[PDB]
Amino acid sequence: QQLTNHIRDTLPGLRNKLQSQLLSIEKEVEEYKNFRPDDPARKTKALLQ
Amino acid sequence: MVQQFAVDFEKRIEGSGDQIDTYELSGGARINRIFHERFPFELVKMEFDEKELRREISYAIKNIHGIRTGLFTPDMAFETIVKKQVKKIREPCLKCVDMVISELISTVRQCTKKLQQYPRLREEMERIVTTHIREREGRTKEQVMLLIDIELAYMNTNHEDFIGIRKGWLTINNIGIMKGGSKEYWFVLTAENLSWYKDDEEKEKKYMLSVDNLKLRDVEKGFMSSKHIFALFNTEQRNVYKDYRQLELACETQEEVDSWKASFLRAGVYPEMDPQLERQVETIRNLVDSYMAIVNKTVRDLMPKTIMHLMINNTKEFIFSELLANLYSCGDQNTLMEESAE
């Protein structure tokens, strides 16, 4: 019972770490997931930036 | 044009660059520094009648002591007055946010309608920016509320609170026959004691008197009627410690006499419950003012910082990084960038 209580008590720490990593990465994968080689608009946006 | 818009907006609101409008206006988003120096006005537009504050404090004490006899002023009599005063500033903070949003919308319009000849483009580039501004209105208001709510959550008396009232010159007209004449001196009246000085350095400390157990009266016209006169007299002892014929004191006007009397009344003196409660009420009133000065100071400082972080900087980041991505998403990209007849 103590081993089970310990293993469950650490879940909140792991959940916050994974949630933090998704928030940091999300801003860029949102754009990478929409990559298409045939996209003159993507090229134009990069040029302006 | 997108490049020119982003650059023009940033110059106008930050104030950087050349070609500044040195003559015509105080304008171009430098108006916002007025709100940050106008919001300090709304925080003092509010007023209260002190008699309502005294009544409210009195019921606060009696309602904290439910049945018990009171020895010391309860702390909750302080906390529940401060919480009630702080709730009042929710409104002016929201007015400040709304005024700032209004100026951002006006500035976006100047940088858009006046510089672009293409139809439809000046609509998309105005619509998108004002939509983004409105969403930040939402996030900004939540943060302001979670700041005032924090001011209520805990009372901190460590930094600048009053850590544990009237001044002017008076002349004594009736001097003992061994000296004669009249003596002009510096008088300091506090809520606790009276102190006599020879000058405004307040170094001599020649006389000290208690405020308690003294009485005030007017004087009969047995004198050359050139000054207004009152008397501070004692009925519990034959002398006012160091006495000068019941300390008859002349003033230039009756209004000065009445202001003095009012100051004595504030200090605890009675006119020509009462023993215990009135002293407790005055202690709380003073402590409340000293703490509210700190609350107001902190609010004036943090509000413009909250707005800059949450509304202004995110708008600039949007203009530089996202604006073009959204214009490609509007309409059908066929009627956009179609020349007007002119």
Curated annotation (Swiss-Prot), chain B:
For this UniProt record, give its keywords in alphabetical order, as a comma-separated list: Cell membrane, Cell projection, Coated pit, Cytoplasmic vesicle, Disease variant, Endocytosis, Epilepsy, GTP-binding, Hydrolase, Membrane, Methylation, Microtubule, Motor protein, Nitration, Nucleotide-binding, Phosphoprotein, Synapse
- Phosphoserine-modified residues are where? 16
Give its localization. Answer: Cell membrane; Membrane, Clathrin-coated pit; Cytoplasmic vesicle; Presynapse
Gene Ontology process terms (BP): clathrin coat assembly involved in endocytosis; endocytosis; endosome organization; protein homooligomerization; protein homotetramerization; receptor internalization; receptor-mediated endocytosis; regulation of vesicle size
Q: Which residues form the PH domain?
A: 165-269
Q: What is the effect of changing residue 76 to R?
A: Significantly decreases receptor-mediated endocytosis
Residues bearing PTM Phosphotyrosine: 23
Mind listing the GO molecular function terms for this protein?
A: GDP binding; GTP binding; GTPase activity; identical protein binding; microtubule binding; phosphatidylinositol-3,4,5-trisphosphate binding; phosphatidylinositol-4,5-bisphosphate binding; protein homodimerization activity
Q: Name one GO cellular component term.
A: cytoplasm
- Superkingdom, according to UniProt? Eukaryota
Mod. after translation: Phosphorylated by CDK5 leading to synaptic vesicle endocytosis (SVE) activation.
Result for mutant: residue 3 to R: Significantly decreases receptor-mediated endocytosis
The entry's free-text remark on domains says: The dynamin-type G mediates homodimerization and plays a role in self-assembly. The C-terminal proline-rich domain (PRD) mediates interaction with SH3-binding partners. Is required for DNM1 self-assembly.
Q: Which disease is it linked to?
A: Developmental and epileptic encephalopathy 31A: An autosomal dominant epileptic encephalopathy, a heterogeneous group of severe early-onset epilepsies characterized by refractory seizures, neurodevelopmental impairment, and poor prognosis. Development is normal prior to seizure onset, after which cognitive and motor delays become apparent.
As for what it does, the entry says: Catalyzes the hydrolysis of GTP and utilizes this energy to mediate vesicle scission and participates in many forms of endocytosis, such as clathrin-mediated endocytosis or synaptic vesicle endocytosis as well as rapid endocytosis (RE). Associates to the membrane, through lipid binding, and self-assembles into rings and stacks of interconnected rings through oligomerization to form a helical polymer around the vesicle membrane leading to constriction of invaginated coated pits around their necks.
- Per the similarity annotation, which family is this? Belongs to the TRAFAC class dynamin-like GTPase superfamily. Dynamin/Fzo/YdjA family.
What protein name is recorded for this chain?
Answer: Dynamin-1
Organism field: Homo sapiens (Human)
Question: Lineage from the top down?
Answer: Eukaryota, Metazoa, Chordata, Craniata, Vertebrata
Q: Which gene encodes it?
A: DNM1
